[PDB]
Paper text:
If the HK incorporates a REC domain (REC-1) is denoted as hybrid histidine kinase (hHK), and the first His-Asp phosphotransfer event occurs in the same polypeptide chain. Then, HPt protein containing a phosphorylatable His shuffles the phosphoryl group from the phosphorylatable Asp in the REC-1 domain to the phosphorylatable Asp in the REC domain of an RR (REC-2) in two more phosphotransfer steps. In fungi, the HPt accepts the phosphoryl group from REC-1 domains of various hHKs upstream of the signaling pathway and forwards it downstream to REC-2 domains present in at least two conserved RRs, Ssk1 and Skn7. Also, we have obtained the crystal structures of Ct_HPt alone and in complex with REChHK6 bound to the phosphomimetic BeF3−, as well as the crystal structures of REChHK3 and RECCa_Sln1.
Numbering used by the authors: 43 to 63, 65 to 174
The structure:
């Protein structure tokens, strides 16, 4: 009975859980790798924000969307989707956004969300894998 609320897609992550032979031999190493990797990615997003590098932010966004999607971590993936789009000058209505200043700001907002939601999910997983 694991409730991750809006953070986890039960179908996608559930499939992962069913691959365990009840010590989480497969799922937990994978969750750990996701989080270690996630934080390396955020550091780079931080650096890219400092240097105001929209193209790099987009790539970083695209990458973390893909790894989070594979685990069914949908709240993180949606934040990463935002970073991908705004990096390419596309708003959430899908319109062009020429003003780089606004894109940067939006990405910052989205990155703060992704980071916070990653923390919250990491806590819930630690609890799950310690039972």
């Amino acid at each position: 009975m694991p409730d991750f609320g809006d953070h986890v897609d039960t179908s996608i992550f559930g499939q992962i859980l069913e691959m365990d032979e009840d010590d989480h031999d497969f799922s937990a190493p994978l969750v750990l790798n996701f989080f270690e990797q996630a934080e390396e990615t955020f550091q780079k997003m931080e650096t890219a924000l400092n240097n105001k590098d929209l193209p790099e932010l987009s790539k970083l966004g695209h990458f973390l969307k893909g790894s989070s999607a594979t685990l069914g971590f949908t709240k993180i993936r949606d934040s990463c989707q935002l970073i991908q789009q705004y990096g390419h000058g596309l708003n959430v209505d899908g319109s062009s956004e020429p003003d780089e200043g606004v894109c940067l700001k939006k990405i910052a907002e989205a990155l703060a969300s992704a980071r916070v939601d990653t923390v919250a999910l990491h806590k819930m997983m630690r609890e799950f894998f310690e039972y």
